[PDB]
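From: lab user (bench 3)
To: helpdesk
Subject: output format question, protein + J9D

Hello, I'm new to running complex predictions and I'm not sure whether the block I got back is the full result or only part of it. Here's what I submitted:
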Amino acid sequence: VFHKIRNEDLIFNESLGQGTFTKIFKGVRREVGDYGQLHETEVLLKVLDKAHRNYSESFFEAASMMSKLSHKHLVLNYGVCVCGDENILVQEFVKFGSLDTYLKKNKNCINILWKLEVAKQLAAAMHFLEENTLIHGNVCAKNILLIREEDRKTGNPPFIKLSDPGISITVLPKDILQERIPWVPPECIENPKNLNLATDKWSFGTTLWEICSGGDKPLSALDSQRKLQFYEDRHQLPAPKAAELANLINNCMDYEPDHRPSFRAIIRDLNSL
Ligand SMILES: N#Cc1ccc(Nc2nc(N)cc(-n3cnc(CCO)c3)n2)cc1
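Helpdesk reply: Thanks, we reran it on our side. This is the complete output you should expect:
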């Protein structure tokens, strides 16, 4: 279970965007830290919409299991605030935000080595989850956070963390799942209860495509009906302009879930490049 944080110890500041049935804010948490020192800590406040409070269990189940495992590439959740009529997840504040936005704003200076390094880090996080048989369920660039930028001057690579998946696709309305094609894999469009470790391998491929496409959203030009037919006709995504990872993307986005490669094999493939 999560640590409970009092509403009185939280300050809400600027909106940082939205997720499915959620709103995201920068905030501050007043707390007693190590050695009894008082801190005012920057936090990320993720607020479930009041009109959708019936999703609260799924909303928190998302963060909870992951938070039971500690890992350098997994986002740190501090706790929850459920004072009053609020359902709030309190998470570490990451300096450079989510990867979808970062890729869009920085595509003109993100090269193949940056992408490869980010791909390796995401794959390491997914390998850790796979070895713990823990399904994420919503791997996408919007759920990757950039802790540290690349610094060629000190040879330092960028550093990312995988964030929580949000409300599960197993409880979400069908139209939202359809709009999430091609992150949601075909077997889960057919039946959301098919959610499996193999799900994350497909979504990881879609996420690599995002990383390689400067923040473009694959199939964004297709409405929901056409995204459905894309799966019915068994199409693959087009290779990104910088196509170094295209074979890996397509191997991960295998319409046969049992044929998708282990994250160990994915990592060995990345290391070959
Ligand atoms: N300009 C700007 C700027 C924006 C955001 C941050 N920091 C931050 N920290 C987090 N822990 C999570 C997020 N975040 C943002 N969008 C999502 C979507 C769901 O993943 C998550 N952003 C820092 C700078």
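A quick orientation on your result: The chain is about 35% helix and 20% strand. Let us know if anything else is unclear.
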